Ligand binder design. Sequence first.
Ligand SMILES: CCCCC[C@H]1O[C@@H](O)C[C@@H]1SC[C@H](NC(=O)CC[C@H](N)C(=O)O)C(=O)NCC(=O)O
Ligand SMILES: N[C@@H](CCC(=O)N[C@@H](CS)C(=O)NCC(=O)O)C(=O)O
Lengths: 221, 221
Amino acid sequence: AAKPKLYYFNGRGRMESIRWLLAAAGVEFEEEFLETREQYEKMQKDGHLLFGQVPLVEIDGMMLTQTRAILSYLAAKYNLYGKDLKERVRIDMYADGTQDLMMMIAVAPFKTPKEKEESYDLILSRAKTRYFPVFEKILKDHGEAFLVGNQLSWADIQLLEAILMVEELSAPVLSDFPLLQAFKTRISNIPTIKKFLQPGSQRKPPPDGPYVEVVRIVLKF
Amino acid sequence: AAKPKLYYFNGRGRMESIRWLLAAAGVEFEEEFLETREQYEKMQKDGHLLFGQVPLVEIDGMMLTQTRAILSYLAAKYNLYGKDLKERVRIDMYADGTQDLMMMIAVAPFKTPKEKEESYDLILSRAKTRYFPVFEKILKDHGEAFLVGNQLSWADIQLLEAILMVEELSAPVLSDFPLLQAFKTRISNIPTIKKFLQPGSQRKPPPDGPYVEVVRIVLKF
Ligand SMILES: CCCCC[C@H]1O[C@@H](O)C[C@@H]1SC[C@H](NC(=O)CC[C@H](N)C(=O)O)C(=O)NCC(=O)O
Ligand SMILES: N[C@@H](CCC(=O)N[C@@H](CS)C(=O)NCC(=O)O)C(=O)O
């Protein structure tokens, strides 16, 4: 058997969504870490990071190096990638949207004070007036627990995380999205999802000052 | 019948990779263009666009809207995604770097002449060391026709488009790379590819003056 080890910084980043999916997959995973600019260089020159970039996930003997390349491998392996091509596309179409949303968030910290300020306000508007109303309707129109084949999917997860991450900025955000709140609590109380959500987990906190710089040092921003 | 009427701009942009995919596949297609913002608004008003963002590509009675997804769907349909999920992912990683490379290029015209030089130099220096040496090494190792396990795959098509995408800046670049020049030829020599590379094909021209100014209008950038 394999013991899923994942290298990346100590924070959200492109490794977060990977953690979630694994947790929900009901899988225990250990993990290394990245702190020094030289640490990068070692494993770099070690010959692992195909295009010389992380995240990286030692699993099945393979060394995955590209984000979405990784997620897709995972989700499919652990049957959360729909069944037929018709549905798998709905997942992806969804995942790309949330991803875009979460992405705007993970990046704003590096921006200048005026920059990150203006981008945050915007994140709310793009979530409230573009990404949330759409998901609310998907739920209302088909009235169901899940999002696609009436079964747990990586789109379900991806959405939850996205909702959580958005409330961390504005808590009363879901104020106008009923079907979602239900979705949130419904999914939150899922066994594997709850465990990962309890104070004891591998889950990481939001982007903090110390983390920003510890990043700009390992990669030389 | 099969009428992939994919809506987008008169330029390369995000669709360009999609076009290449349909091309090699051996699938003809139409493509209504994006001229006035009144189109964008009125179309987005009909709920053709999920999160309100093109590429838009109606196919199989459906109406897809998220790039990475669209490629993933097509590639899978037209049997160009490995033999199992391991090949699928391997391909996915490759397709990611190529898409990364093609991305700073595709956005370049938007910046400013000053940035352009640096960025373009960066692209070259990145492509020459970052990606090409990697691909070359691979082709040598498993020494065979295609990058994957002997069969046209999304990767190959992604690489070729990438190669030529850069040669339109540094014609002599592929010189230091033997296996890449060889791969380049045989792949251009694909029946369906050669026909897509013909002077009469739907293949779009690299970005330009009016193309850089249209988006800033239609999409009010
Ligand atoms: C001109 C083409 C390539 C470079 C610039 C474009 O690429 C995008 O990164 C930004 C721009 S314009 C194209 C832009 N697409 C996106 O921003 C979403 C990308 C997503 N992967 C998708 O499948 O649609 C748009 O459709 N409108 C933006 C807006 O209001 O949401
Ligand atoms: N988008 C690529 C990674 C791109 C990227 O910015 N990754 C950063 C983490 S923020 C990295 O790995 N460092 C850049 C480097 O290799 O110097 C992927 O999906 O694997």
